[PDB]
Design an enzyme around this catalytic site. Structure first.
Site, mmCIF file in Angstrom:
data_model
loop_
_atom_site.group_PDB
_atom_site.id
_atom_site.type_symbol
_atom_site.label_atom_id
_atom_site.label_comp_id
_atom_site.label_asym_id
_atom_site.label_seq_id
_atom_site.Cartn_x
_atom_site.Cartn_y
_atom_site.Cartn_z
ATOM 1 N N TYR B 1 0.743 -1.313 0.013
ATOM 2 C CA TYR B 1 0.026 0.093 -0.063
ATOM 3 C C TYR B 1 0.825 1.274 0.009
ATOM 4 O O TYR B 1 2.075 1.139 0.212
ATOM 5 C CB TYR B 1 -1.096 0.127 1.264
ATOM 6 C CG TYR B 1 -2.016 1.037 1.102
ATOM 7 C CD1 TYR B 1 -3.242 0.603 0.153
ATOM 8 C CD2 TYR B 1 -2.175 2.074 1.800
ATOM 9 C CE1 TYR B 1 -4.282 1.472 0.097
ATOM 10 C CE2 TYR B 1 -3.164 2.794 1.670
ATOM 11 C CZ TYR B 1 -4.245 2.639 0.824
ATOM 12 O OH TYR B 1 -5.417 3.425 0.578
ATOM 13 N N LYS B 2 0.150 2.418 -0.123
ATOM 14 C CA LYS B 2 1.124 3.763 -0.210
ATOM 15 C C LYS B 2 1.891 3.751 1.045
ATOM 16 O O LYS B 2 1.408 4.047 2.222
ATOM 17 C CB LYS B 2 0.095 4.921 -0.247
ATOM 18 C CG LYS B 2 -0.613 4.951 -1.584
ATOM 19 C CD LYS B 2 -1.744 6.162 -1.584
ATOM 20 C CE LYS B 2 -2.934 5.392 -0.890
ATOM 21 N NZ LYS B 2 -3.701 4.481 -1.918
ATOM 22 N N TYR B 3 3.141 3.735 0.767
ATOM 23 C CA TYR B 3 4.142 3.674 1.776
ATOM 24 C C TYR B 3 3.909 5.092 2.997
ATOM 25 O O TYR B 3 3.779 4.693 4.058
ATOM 26 C CB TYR B 3 5.691 3.885 1.180
ATOM 27 C CG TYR B 3 6.693 4.086 2.240
ATOM 28 C CD1 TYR B 3 6.690 3.103 3.380
ATOM 29 C CD2 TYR B 3 7.856 4.967 2.045
ATOM 30 C CE1 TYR B 3 7.667 3.464 4.379
ATOM 31 C CE2 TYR B 3 8.659 4.981 3.217
ATOM 32 C CZ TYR B 3 8.642 4.084 4.232
ATOM 33 O OH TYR B 3 9.671 4.216 5.055
#
Lengths: 125, 121
Positions: B1-3
């Site tokens: 997922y979005k870091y």
DNA sequence: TATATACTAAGAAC
DNA sequence: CGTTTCATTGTTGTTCTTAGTATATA
DNA sequence: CAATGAAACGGAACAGTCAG
């Protein structure tokens, strides 16, 4: 009169900007149980209306004071005050003020006549 | 997922009189169990993923505060990056004296509604 | 007794 | 036309540096 | 991890239309 609270209010302008949506949601939750459907054929006595009518009205004692910053006061045929606000938006939701602490038509007239309707008449230093 | 995104875990304990003093035996206590679990996981998350978010919020209490000023809901510590200033706040409740403090500061446990609990969390 | 040679353990730089 | 909100580009962690202390060796 | 940008909206005012 001195010691008494106002009972009749004159509509000035519509405002719907200046508050974050969280603040708007908070205000809606606070006021939800006080809103009453507005009837054009049976308007409330405490709130007279001009040509512009609201969808729902709230009695003044249950309402909230809002601090409004607008470019100037311009003539209007939609509000009973004979005037409205140009570019209006809510600066603060005055929870520190009571409903009866709203300004009067005398204050509105003073502001209108101070600088020919312009609400900006103070120099920057 | 979005870091740059981060994990967020909110804690929510039944504050009714139900489990505040259930204590069928004298070897455990569900509140002394739930608060122990919260303290342990939260101290572990301190070192593990200090970038993440945690929050603890009790429901059914008698004192009130939350974002929407509802009934019987207490947001003990809001969502924010974990820290010691809250390790201590949780630790303040660990104990029989601590449960006495908790009850006489927020309440025995009033009526509630998990609908409003889900709405508020 | 002097000298450096070794190491790890720091650091900060990027 | 003005205000507000959202999304994205700059952000860095790691490696190397020097340090410091370490000791035995000649 | 956030400053910078948009886009989305909020009326403000106008007039033509339709109802009546």
């Amino acid at each position: 009169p001195p010691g008494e609270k106002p009972s009749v209010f004159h509509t000035l302008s519509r405002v719907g900007s200046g508050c974050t949506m969280k603040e708007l949601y908070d205000l809606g939750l606070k006021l939800a149980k006080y809103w009453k459907p507005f009837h054009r054929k049976a308007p409330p006595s405490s709130i007279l209306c001009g040509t512009e009518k609201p969808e729902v009205y709230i009695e003044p004692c249950n309402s909230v004071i809002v601090q409004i910053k607008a470019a100037e006061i311009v003539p209007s045929d939609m509000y009973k005050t004979g005037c409205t606000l140009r570019f209006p938006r809510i600066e603060k939701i005055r929870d520190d003020k009571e409903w009866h602490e709203c300004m009067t038509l005398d204050d509105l007239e003073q502001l209108r006549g101070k600088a020919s309707g312009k609400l900006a008449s103070k120099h920057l230093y | 997922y979005k870091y740059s995104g981060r994990d967020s875990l909110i804690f929510l304990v039944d504050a009714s009189k139900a489990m505040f003093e259930s204590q069928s035996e004298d070897e455990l206590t569900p509140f002394d169990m739930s608060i122990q679990c919260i303290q342990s996981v939260y101290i572990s998350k301190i070192i593990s993923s200090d970038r993440d978010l945690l929050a603890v919020v009790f429901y059914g209490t008698e004192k009130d505060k939350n974002s929407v000023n509802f009934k019987n809901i207490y947001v003990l510590q809001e969502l924010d990056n974990p820290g010691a200033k809250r390790i201590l706040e949780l630790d303040q409740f660990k104990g029989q004296q601590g449960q006495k403090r908790f009850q006489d500061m927020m309440g025995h446990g009033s009526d509630y509604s998990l609908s409003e609990v889900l709405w508020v969390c």
